[PDB]
């Protein structure tokens, strides 16, 4: 609703990373999606679309308003046919691991 200092600073931090879009724009115009989902009226200065219909997926759908779930979540690892080499697997684990950490034993 009114965005928190916290959230803005988060969002900005995220933004100021890497990776580049597909539909660029000329600075002489606003370019509003050629796939006509967008409700594009006739605006003063924007022409329409990006000038260049390329190729990329799209679709329509609303967002499920789901609250912050104060519980850890389980995952069924349904598999896809792209099968990495053991060493790389391992490696990437090594790369992303939060481990080591001090294990709560619990009870035997």
């Amino acid at each position: 609703a009114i965005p928190t200092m916290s959230d803005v600073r988060s969002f900005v931090a995220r933004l100021m990373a890497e990776g580049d879009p597909q539909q660029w724009f000329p600075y002489r115009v606003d370019q509003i999606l050629y796939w006509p989902e967008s409700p594009f009226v006739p605006p003063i200065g924007p022409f329409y679309a990006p000038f260049r219909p390329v190729n990329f997926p799209f679709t329509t759908g609303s967002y499920t308003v789901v609250p912050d779930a104060s519980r850890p979540l389980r995952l069924l690892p349904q598999y896809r046919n792209a099968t990495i080499t053991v060493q790389q697997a391992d490696d990437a684990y090594e790369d992303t691991a939060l481990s080591p950490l001090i294990t709560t034993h619990g009870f035997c």
Partner: protein, 50 residues
């Protein structure tokens, strides 16, 4: 070209020189390819690689 009706002409058929021409060539589909069709970055400058 030379007058055929002259002297000096050899009639030497040898194993070495076994008649041949090019009777037919390979035209297998598989063989037709090599390869890549030529394309362009939409048509604009070096940006549209995508």
């Amino acid at each position: 070209t030379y007058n055929i009706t002259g002297d000096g002409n050899s009639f030497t058929p040898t194993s070495d020189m076994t008649s041949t021409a090019a009777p037919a060539i390979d035209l297998k589909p598989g063989v037709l390819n090599p390869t890549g069709k030529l394309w362009r970055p939409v048509g604009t400058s070096v940006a549209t690689i995508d």
